[PDB]
From Swiss-Prot, chain B:
Family, per entry: Belongs to the TRAFAC class myosin-kinesin ATPase superfamily. Myosin family.
Shown chain mapped onto the complete sequence: 507 to 658 of 1979
Localization per record: Cytoplasm, Myofibril
Entry domain remark: The rodlike tail sequence is highly repetitive, showing cycles of a 28-residue repeat pattern composed of 4 heptapeptides, characteristic for alpha-helical coiled coils.
Protein name: Myosin-11
Assembly description: Muscle myosin is a hexameric protein that consists of 2 heavy chain subunits (MHC), 2 alkali light chain subunits (MLC) and 2 regulatory light chain subunits (MLC-2).
Protein task: Muscle contraction.
Amino acid sequence: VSSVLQLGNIVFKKERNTDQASMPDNTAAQKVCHLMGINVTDFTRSILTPRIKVGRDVVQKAQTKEQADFAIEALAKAKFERLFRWILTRVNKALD
Amino acid sequence: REGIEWNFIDFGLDLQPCIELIERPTNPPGVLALLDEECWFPKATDTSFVEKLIQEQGNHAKFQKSKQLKDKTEFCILHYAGKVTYNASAWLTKNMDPLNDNVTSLLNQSSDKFVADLWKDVDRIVGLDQMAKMTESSLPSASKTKKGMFRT
């Protein structure tokens, strides 16, 4: 629950010289990564510059500010929905 | 069926053309069905979905177009409990439910057991690499699901 809230404090700022965005703080990501049990640099690379695969190719690209905001927004709601489904199966487990 | 003395009373209450308007998948299609297919076209937007919805539905006798809002993009339907105005902006994104798969696989293999249990099923996370850009939303496809079994 706290990490779902904390993802909303991660701030992408549009950078003029590449037209992408970068992560201009470390604390917001650092708090989130500690409470997700994962790594700051691998998370920071994944959110800004993902190394995806389209079928056959490997597409290593940079995402824009609007996209990086959308990616963190989608991850927060998805982790919340996963918690509710887990809690519901945990309730059903004891009733039955 | 039992063959008693009776004569049929219409009570006038059936809501089915309202239900077909949203539900129908083939023959004249419904609101969900058009939202399902427009979703997989690289020159579709939430706006094209509404202009297609006028093409299939339009004259339908439970459908009505907006107060001339085609900018926001909205439509109206006549439900049993009243006429709702629905605003279709960011509905292809909601019907799709896409996520960054690169960050998702990091959670699958995390050093918290609880996060790793919660993100145990990554097999149906759907990559698209879609460029949300107003006016010209652009939908590439970067699909990634086991056996190709994904569902809208």
